[PDB]
Structures are given as structure tokens and as C-alpha cells.
Amino acid sequence: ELDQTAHQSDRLNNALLMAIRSSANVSSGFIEQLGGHDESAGKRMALSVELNNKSQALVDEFVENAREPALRGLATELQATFAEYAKAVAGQREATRQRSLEQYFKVNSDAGNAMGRLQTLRQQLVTTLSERG
Amino acid sequence: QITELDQTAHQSDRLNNALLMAIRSSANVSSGFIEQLGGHDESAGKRMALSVELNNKSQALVDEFVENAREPALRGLATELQATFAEYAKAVAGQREATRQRSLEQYFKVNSDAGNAMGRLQTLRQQLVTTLSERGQQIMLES
Ligand SMILES: [Cl-]
């Protein structure tokens, strides 16, 4: 079950890295569109979508495998904060498709706040996994 | 052996936090540039401050990581990570300068320096995580 700890750590760390890369790509893509780099922006938008799908799958696996009573509530809190973040990054993508600076501003506050919480929740989970091992 | 095992985990954790804050740092510049272009200068300035904060915390973790990377199986990767992070931090600083100056043209080149260096940072993290985990397991197989 120590092998399970390593699999859980890989899922959590990769999910969060891919999730922030998804958002970074959509913001970069938006700036590319502003500069007229429209073929390059589309690559960024495709990578944002793909990174969202991959990171969501890893979060889902993480919560499927976080059965221990010490982790159950914290893993669901991670599931919920991650869903909040993913819905903000989907908002960033829609604002980019609409080329709307104001729509981007509205949703970006939600994205930054949910990512700040993901960083602190990750540390809580790392600590619980660490005592679990 | 529990000491060297707790050290191996701390190192992996420094690396993970450092890379997450580093990517966040660049994302905040990009999204701060979009906020500034939409007239939200106060939010954009907070994002520039957060970009600086995050990359300075990352830098401190990378430096501490290298200081604690003694084994030859690890210090070569670690000094590459530190050298690559230096390039990355400079490119993100260039992104912030381009934002404060409101220049798309300056932005685009450095976002590219930044993304290149970040691609390399990501691979080095993977290699270092695997190397740390191999050392932890080697200790275990000793026990
Ligand atoms: Cl953030």
C-alpha cells in the first residue's frame, strides 16, 4: 500500500501541474489572439482543453483511491475546489473564444482564488499522505 | 534510515511546490497583462506582485533543493534545474517588464523564452522525482 502512496502522489502532483498549465495556456492564447497570432493561439487552446481532460481524470482517480477515513473529507474538498478551478478555466476559454477582455477579467478572479487554495490544499494532502505512509 | 527517507520526501516536496509556484508566476503575468488591457490596472498590479512573490518563493526552494542534493545521482540534475530556473525567472521578469510597458511585441518573445525554459524545468523535475524515489526505495530495500 506504500505503492498506493506513490501512485496517489503522482496523481495529485500531476493533476495540479497540468491544471495550472491549462490556464496558463489559455491566457497565453488570449494574448496571442490580441497580437494577431491566430494559428498559434489555437494550439494553446487545444493544449488547454487536453490538459483539463488529463488533470480531471487524475483528480477523479485520486479521489477514487482516497478511501482511508483520514483522507475522505479532504479528498472530496480537493474534488470540489478542483471542480471550481476547472469551471473558471473553462470560463477563461469561453472568454478567449469570444475575444472578450471583460469576460476574462470576471472569471480570472475565480481562477486565481481557486488555484491559491489548491496550493494550500495540496500541502494538507501531502501531510496526510505522509503520515499515512 | 528514516532520517534519509524523510529528507528524500522533503526534497521531492520542495521540487513540486517550486514548479507549481513557478507556473503560477507566469500565469499571473499573462492574466495581469489581459486585465491591464481591459482597464483593470489595480488587479493587474496585484498580479504582478503575486508573480514576483511566487517566483521568489520558487527560487528559494530551488536553491534549498540544490543545497541538499549531495549524491552524484542527483546533483547534476539539480544544478541543471537551478541553471534552467535562472533562465525561466529572467524570462518571467521580462514578461512583467513588457506588461508594465504595455508592449505586446516585447511580451511575445519572452513568453517564448519562458515556455522553453519551463518545458526543460518540467522534464528535470520528472527526472529528479524519479531519482529521489529510487533513492527512497533503495534505502527501503536496505532496511
Ligand atoms: Cl495563481
How far from the centroid of its chain's Cα atoms is residue A60's Cα? Answer: 12
CA dist list (Å): A117 to A4, A31, A114, A121: 25, 26, 5, 6
Residues, beta carbon < 5 Å, ion ligand 1: A 112, 115; B 24
Domain that holds residue A102: 2-132
Consult the annotation and say whether B52 binds a ligand: no
Single-letter amino acid, residue B87: E
Burial category of A100 from C-beta neighbours within 10 Å (exposed 0-12, middle 13-18, buried 19 and up): middle
* Breaks in chain A after residues (C–N exceeding 2.5 Å): none
CA-only gyration radius of chain B, Å: 17
Q: Name the domain count of chain A.
A: 1
Q: Does B25 touch chain A (CB under 8 A)?
A: no
Consult the annotation and say whether A24 binds a ligand: yes
Q: What is the resolution of this structure in A?
A: 1.6
Distance of alpha carbon B48 from alpha carbon B54, whole angstroms: 10
Give the start-end residues of each E strand in A1-133. none
Distance of alpha carbon A20 from alpha carbon A115, whole angstroms: 8
Distance of alpha carbon A111 from alpha carbon A125, whole angstroms: 20
Buried b (16+ CB within 10 A) or exposed e, B110-119: bbebbbebbe
Query: What CATH number has the domain bearing residue A27?
Result: 1.20.120.30
Single-letter amino acid, residue A49: V
To which H or E segment does residue A10 belong? helix A2-34
Distance of alpha carbon B48 from alpha carbon B109, whole angstroms: 18
- Which residues, 6+ apart, have CB-to-CB distance to B65 below 8 Å? B11, B14, B15, B18, B78, B81, B82
Interface test with A, best of B13, B34, B95, B122 (most A CBs within 10 A): B34
Residue A36 zone, left/alpha/beta (φ > 0; ψ -120 to 50; rest): left
Method of elucidation: X-ray
Consult the annotation and say whether B117 binds a ligand: no
A24, B30: Cβ pair inside 8 Å? yes
Candidates B20, B33, B47; nearest CB to A20 = B20
How far from the centroid of its chain's Cα atoms is residue B12's Cα? Answer: 13
Distance of alpha carbon B139 from alpha carbon A108, whole angstroms: 45
| Cβ atoms of residues B88 and B110 within 8 Å | no
Consult the annotation and say whether A23 binds a ligand: yes
CB contacts of A104 in chain B (<8 Å) are 31, 34-35, 38
Distance of alpha carbon A129 from alpha carbon B21, whole angstroms: 21
Interface test with B, best of A27, A107, A125, A128 (most B CBs within 10 A): A27
